[PDB]
Amino acid sequence: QKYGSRTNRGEVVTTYGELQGTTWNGGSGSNTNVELFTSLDEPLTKMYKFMFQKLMDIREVVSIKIEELGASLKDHFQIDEFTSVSLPAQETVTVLGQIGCDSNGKLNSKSVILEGDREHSAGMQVPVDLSELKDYSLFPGQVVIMEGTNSTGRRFVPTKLYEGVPLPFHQPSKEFEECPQQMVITACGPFTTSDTITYDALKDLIDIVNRDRPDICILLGPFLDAKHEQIENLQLTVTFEDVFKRCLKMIIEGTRPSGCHLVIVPSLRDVHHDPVYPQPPFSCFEPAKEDKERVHFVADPCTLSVNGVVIGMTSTDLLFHMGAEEISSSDRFSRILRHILTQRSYYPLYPPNEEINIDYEALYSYTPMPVTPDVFIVPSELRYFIKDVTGCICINPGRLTKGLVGGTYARFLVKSGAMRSTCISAQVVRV
Template sequence: MFAAKISSSANRTTTTDTRATNLRANFKLSTKDKETLPECLHEGQVDRDLKMPVSWETIASELETFDLVPQDDGSIEKLLEHCITYRLTEDKIVNEWIAFSMTRIGFALNAGNVDIFEHEVLSKKANKTRPAAIKRNTRAPMHDLNSLEELVQAETEEENLLDSYTTPAKAGTHKRVLTTPEQPQSKKVSMTRSPRLLFSPASFSPSPNPSLKYSSRANRGEVVVSFGTAQGATWQGMGGRSATVQLLLMPEDSIVKRFKYMFQKLRDIRDVLNDRIEDLSQVLTEHYNIEAIRSVAMPVQESVTFLGQIACDSNGKLNAKSVILQGDLKHSAGMQVPVDLSELKEFSLFPGQVVALEGTNSTSRCIVAFRLYEGVPLPFYKPEEVLEGLEQQMVLVACGPFTTSDSITYDPMLDLIDVINRDRPDVCILLGPFVDVRHQQIESCQLTVTYQEVFKQCMKGIVEGTRGSGSHLVIVPSLRDAHHDFVYPQAPFHCFEPSKEDKERVHFVSDPCTLNINEVVFAVTSTDVLFHMGAEEINSPPGGSDRFTRILKHILTQRSYYPLYPPAEEINIDYECLQLYAQLPVTPDILIVPSELRYFIKDVLGCICINPGRLTKGQVGGTYGRLFVQKPSSERVDRQTPCVAAQVVKI
């Protein structure tokens, strides 16, 4: 029937009819099979039923929309044939033709060129994705709760039928529970077969075995890093009795809901980067009393000051021989010039860093730098109304993943809940990932429920499990959360709504965010900016200073949660939102930067920076952080850090 439709459309060759007939036989799908199609044959290609054929008029209308005039009638007939053969909609094939023809100058729409288009685009896409479709068809089908219940019920009925014909087991032998039509299964046994039991906070997979390495860990509760001295022998909070948690910025200056992304233009990205250069250049010129800025491409014999952004001259890693300075649009028209760093005694540079260089450029092809002007940090936060008598607050900080790599059970999370109930911190800052996309069971699609359901149960366990402690919960998303938008900056989680009794103490915030906790400013991000910048940063002399301190200083002086450009390959950035929501409004009192790198607590430019580590490291337990903070009295003239004490502790 399919071949008859093709032959009745227009004059077609026998080869085309045979190919179309074979394609129809190969792609004759049931509803379940459609889910396993390759992506190029799934989106917009099988969404219509084969009983609703494409039309000549619709293709002509789509072409007219783009002012495409066919040179002959056979071109539209061939496009109609390829729509049916490759299961494409009219707008889809026209879009494919536009993308193909734009790469060829003077490529007219005629029957001969449509054949070339079919040979080089459509047939190659179909052949390229067909093995993936076959491989995907062999995978076990995914089930939701309803279909899983039906399978369990069918299996139970089958076992009941088989068990009715068995004899009672002898004493001491291990066989399945005896059930007969007169003696049905007990409720206790039937509950163990329910899929909802697999969907408990302690087990989210068909193989809910806990990690042996995690359960047999040693040194639980050991303090590995300390800062300051805590008052009293034990770390105890007041259960959030007098704690206030709010965003430092107004809601219009913070991400409070989801936003559209993937609508960036290269011109918009350029404008964002140029605005950042100009903003920091104004700070540099005022702080270092720089009189004039010269173009990076103008030849000059005397020593002058150049300003711009550090970049690499290739796609490789930045090194001392590949540094270039990209000027701003105002002074340098965005031009790039290599930089000779041999005259600098010491430096620390990374791609995206905005700097001012003093040097010469005698040939206009290379800047010989003699002096480097680095960024300037922002002032600290000063509240409009000074509140006296603020009590000391205990803040707990933990970063996911909250499961070990060899088990999807949330045992580390449950242990952390026990710590929260025991110590009763005033505020708990919990950073993702909560449903780690790098977990081996998630990567291999072994879960029997959706990622959103796993996250909801995880949140339910945390919120209800800590209700007795009274602690405020601050939930920060991560780019590694499988159920959430993976674009930076990230909006708060949106698929879980706490109950009325928990709404005041549960706070869903964005990544990054700046918090005001009893007049103490916390800057928080779950993105591993330390690891990303550490892989790109260069310094001289090598090993001259602490690498963590250098990177943290760059974050504070560049006034951005993520100053690296271009970013790491694993991160997707919306630059317009980065400019609006990922800039430091002030120098924070506490900077929380969890990382895969080793945990630490450091005082950098008066800001206490803490990497609490991750709650799990592979198959073993990790660490979390805890702090005592209190706003100093306003009577002091000199600034004093509000961080009284801090520790990193093993879970």
């Protein structure tokens, strides 16, 4: 009722980049090449056996994460030697470690501990005293290098916190120099109103897709939300798989006129899918022979290459997860986004939030960020935004539905080699 009678349909709630006309048109995915970013590491494309984590394996994965990031930072900063975190230090020493909270609550400036890696510290921890640090921004699981002293052997006092070093951007090949600008419409779940299971917002978005004919449509989960009031109280008369199959059929068949490449990203809130992160791609739907080349069932997180433009995307609410734990000396979202980019992982928070199941071997293998993406799609319960963080266009299109009321989606234009202005324009628009 409330959604159907909305009056702000099509309103542009946020804008960035070159001004464009009131109407956006795309190439219908004609001269479009969508693939997974070809990096050294193989992508997650199939289910991996889970529910069996050895504490030793978790220890090894965390330790190697710290060690690898510290090695890269040491080469970049020309640091001579790292020192064990636990040992006393009367003079200033450089220490590599990861941040954490001394208790189970939320991190605060008086509850910070630094845990070293196995190579340099035997995994030992030390309390941290942030009284002598003038500026800082710390979240649990953050790999840091600090110059400080430990006079009592019991409390590390940092004096310098080395800044993060983001990965270099992608240097596109000339193969896509002559390709036109590409239009991407991105939306995130939930796709149905809190009190309905009819997917009205999804129908409106599909109508928008057919109207504007974008080159890529990135749909992020959930598609059958686990927190939907109907799902939790067991009022559904059909199986979860059937509802999800109906939703996917609606999406794929309804986009036939647009000829738009669909990129489907699962969510941890998908009640019908495996609850593990990194999430494998959906595998319960077989597109018809006429839609096989258009539909891309990708994994969470995903690094996509679109005519040379690298788009990073994750369904996980990274900003909400890290905002609850980040502590700063004095834009918060920009700080968190820079933290994500500099840590070079799509989920650097450790321990994770209570709402995400992390398989740490798969996390090690499939969460490293190959490069710094040209566009980074990070849907969040927080407010929509389009930010420029260290040259990367971070887009939060919100969620298509916000409770009983309609939500928002985003549309942006990407061209490889433009001007670094790989993102010509971007807009958060209302549904």
